[PDB]
Structure formats: structure tokens, C-alpha cells
Design a protein around this ligand. Structure first.
Ligand SMILES: CCCC[C@@H](CN[C@@H](CCCC)C(=O)N[C@@H](CCC(N)=O)C(=O)N[C@@H](CCCNC(N)=[NH2+])C(N)=O)NC(=O)[C@@H](NC(=O)[C@@H](NC(C)=O)[C@@H](C)O)[C@@H](C)CC
Length: 203
């Protein structure tokens, strides 16, 4: 399908025989699913997100059908806020990010989709994250008025400053919208700005 990002890119998946809903998440290295039982030897891992780290169980070589497309790979099971399909399985179903519906750059998901942005006069690197509702940038000056906000993911919540009507140029495409500033480990471009640059998921 071609999926736009006005709403969360939620899809049905089938894993261990169970239908579940999950978010197609380009900002996730790995696929993380809520507590469930899977049939194998697992090993403990820790994984991280904007709000810190959580402990998960790693299962390898698990078949997962993602809107009807077959994958077989690593699934992490644990107390994630939202079930997420990450790049390890997005690559298997041929999913790419495309600007302007395919007329602009195509970004494959073999590695993290990092791009250059311009914000507040400054050039920075940021992750294109279809699993993020909002855009979160590393501690920086945005002059002007803001509202406090807490945002979560995964590990928990961090406190950020919400600024409105901030111009952000993403790979040379102009966007303007809300930017959240706080101690994120990675600058994140979320759906609020990805929709303005016509970014779609395609597989
Ligand atoms: C689980 C909640 C939904 C998915 C998640 C994906 N964000 C990426 C951002 C990149 C990190 C800052 C992520 O957590 N990725 C993880 C997913 C876990 C995984 N294992 O793949 C990741 O790749 N982690 C890697 C690497 C982390 C960074 N590493 C590094 N900088 N070296 C890892 N292996 O631990 N989205 C979010 O965290 C966003 N949350 C949301 O959009 C919503 N919040 C909730 C709780 O649903 C909304 C209501 O606010 C944040 C940014 C606020 C807008």
C-alpha cells in the first residue's frame, strides 16, 4: 500500500497466530510488542527510547505477517507503550519512505533515516520517525513564548518546551509547525512535519 501520515500508521499484524495492531515505525531499529508468549528460547535485552530504557525478551526468527506481507525476524516483547514494527521487519516487506508521494527522495530503512534539517538558523541531523506524533529537537534556543509539555515513549516521559509556528526545512523541503525542545537523545521529525513534506510509507 501507500500510507500517508495524517493519522498514526497503524496496521494489523499476525504474530504467533494472534492478530494485533502495531505502528509502522521508521524511528525504531527493532520490532517491540506488548507482553505476550512466543514459542522459543528468548534472551533478555535492554532497549531505549526518548524516556529511558526498558527490559525486553528477545525472540529470533519469528514469523510476522504485516498487513499481509510476510516477514521472519527478531521480535522484542515487553512493556512498550505501543506495539511497533521497526526497521528490522520494515526492510523485509520492502517498506520505504518517500517524499512528495514518490517524486522526491526515496529513503530505504537499512540504516536509520537520518537527514539534515534547518531550524532557528542552525543545521542539525534528525531522524524521520513515522512513529512520532510530534517533532522533538535537542536542547536549543528557539526565542519566544512556549508552553510546558510532557511527551512519552519507551522508558517513560520527558519534559519539553512547546513552541509553535517554527519553520523547519527538512532535506530542503520547507515545513512550519510545532517543535518540542528537550533532552532527547536524537532529534526526531514526527508526523506533524512529515505530512507537510508529503512523506508517505510505501510497500
Ligand atoms: C513507543 C512509542 C511510539 C514509538 C516511538 C518511536 N520513537 C523512536 C525514537 C528514537 C529514539 C529517541 C524510538 O523510541 N525508537 C527506539 C525503539 C525501540 C527499538 N529497540 O527499536 C529505538 O530505535 N531504540 C534503539 C536506539 C535508541 C537510540 N540510540 C542511539 N541514539 N544510539 C535501541 N536499540 O534501543 N515514538 C515516540 O517515542 C514518540 N511518542 C509518541 O509519538 C506518542 N507517545 C506514546 C507513549 O505513544 C505520542 C502520544 O506522544 C515521542 C518521540 C514523542 C513524539
Amino acid at each position: 500500500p501507500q500510507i500517508t501520515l495524517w493519522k498514526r500508521p497503524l496496521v494489523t499484524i499476525r504474530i504467533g497466530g494472534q492478530l494485533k495492531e502495531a505502528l509502522l515505525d521508521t524511528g525504531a531499529d527493532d520490532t517491540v510488542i506488548e507482553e505476550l508468549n512466543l514459542p522459543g528460547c528468548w534472551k533478555p535485552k535492554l532497549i531505549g527510547g526518548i524516556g529511558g530504557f526498558i527490559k525486553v525478551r528477545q525472540y529470533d526468527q519469528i514469523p510476522v505477517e504485516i498487513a499481509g506481507h510476510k516477514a521472519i525476524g527478531t521480535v522484542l516483547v515487553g512493556p512498550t507503550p505501543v506495539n511497533i514494527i521497526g526497521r528490522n521487519l520494515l526492510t523485509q516487506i520492502g517498506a520505504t519512505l518517500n517524499f512528495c508521494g514518490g517524486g522526491g527522495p526515496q529513503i530505504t530503512l537499512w540504516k536509520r533515516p537520518l537527514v539534515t534539517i534547518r531550524i532557528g538558523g542552525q543545521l542539525k541531523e534528525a531522524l524521520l520517525d513515522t512513529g512520532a506524533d510530534d517533532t522533538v529537537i535537542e536542547e536549543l534556543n528557539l526565542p519566544g513564548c512556549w508552553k510546558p509539555k510532557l511527551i512519552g515513549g519507551x522508558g517513560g516521559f520527558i519534559k519539553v518546551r512547546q513552541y509553535d509556528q517554527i519553520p523547519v526545512e527538512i532535506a530542503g523541503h520547507k515545513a512550519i509547525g510545532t517543535v518540542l525542545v528537550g533532552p532527547t537523545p536524537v532529534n526526531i521529525i514526527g508526523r506533524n512535519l512529515l505530512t507537510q513534506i508529503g512523506a508517505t510509507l510505501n510497500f
